[PDB]
Amino acid sequence: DVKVADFAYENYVRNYKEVYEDMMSKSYERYLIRDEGKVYSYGLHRVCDNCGIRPAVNRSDDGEYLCETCNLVRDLSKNRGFIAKYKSKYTLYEEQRIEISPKEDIKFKLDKNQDPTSYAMEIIAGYRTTSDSRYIALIKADGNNAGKIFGNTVTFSEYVDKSFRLDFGVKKMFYDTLLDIMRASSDESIKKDLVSRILLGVLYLGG
RNA sequence: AUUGAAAGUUUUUUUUUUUUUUUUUUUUUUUUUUUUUUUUUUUUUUUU
Q: What's the full length of chain A, in residues?
A: 207
A42 CB and strand B closer than 7 A: yes
How remote is the C-alpha of A2 from its chain's centroid?
22
Chain B positions with any atom < 7 A from a protein CB? 3-5
Q: Separation of CA A78 and C1' B22 in angstroms?
A: 81
Query: Cα(A52)–Cα(A68) distance, rounded to whole angstroms?
Result: 16
Q: Please spell the DSSP secondary structure of A103-150, one letter per residue.
A: HHH------TTS-TTTTHHHHHHT-SSSS------------SSHHHHH
Please, what is the Cα angle at A157 between A154 and A158, to 5 degrees? 50
A133 CB and strand B closer than 7 A: no
A93 CB and strand B closer than 7 A: no
Tell me how far apart the 2 most distant CA atoms of chain A are, in Å. 69
Phi and psi (nearest 5°) for A90?
-75, 145
Whether A5 contacts A26, CB under 8 Å: yes
Q: Separation of CA A46 and C1' B7 in angstroms?
A: 20
Whether A150 contacts A20, CB under 8 Å: yes
- The helix/strand/coil state of A58 is coil
How remote is the C-alpha of A119 from its chain's centroid?
18
- Helices A16-25, A156-182: crossing angle, 10 deg rounding: 100
Q: Separation of CA A132 and C1' B18 in angstroms?
A: 38
Produce one character per residue of A110-125: b if its CB has 16 or more CB atoms within 10 Å, e if not: beeeeebeeebebbbb
Phi and psi (nearest 5°) for A79?
-85, -45
Q: Separation of CA A21 and C1' B34 in angstroms?
A: 134
A6: Cβ–Cβ under 8 A, 6 or more apart, which residues? A14, A19, A22
Nearest to A196 by CA among A94, A116, A131, A118: A116
CA distances from A143 to A59, A98, A166, A167, A177 (A): 44, 31, 9, 11, 19
Question: Which nucleotide is the nearest neighbour of A46, by CA and C1'?
Answer: B3
Nearest to A92 by CA among A151, A26, A179, A21: A179
Produce one character per residue of A82-101: b if its CB has 16 or more CB atoms within 10 Å, e if not: beebbeeeeeeeeeeebebe
Question: Which nucleotide is the nearest neighbour of A43, by CA and C1'?
Answer: B3
User: Which experimental approach was used here?
Assistant: cryo-EM
A46 CB and strand B closer than 7 A: yes
Resolution in A: 3.5
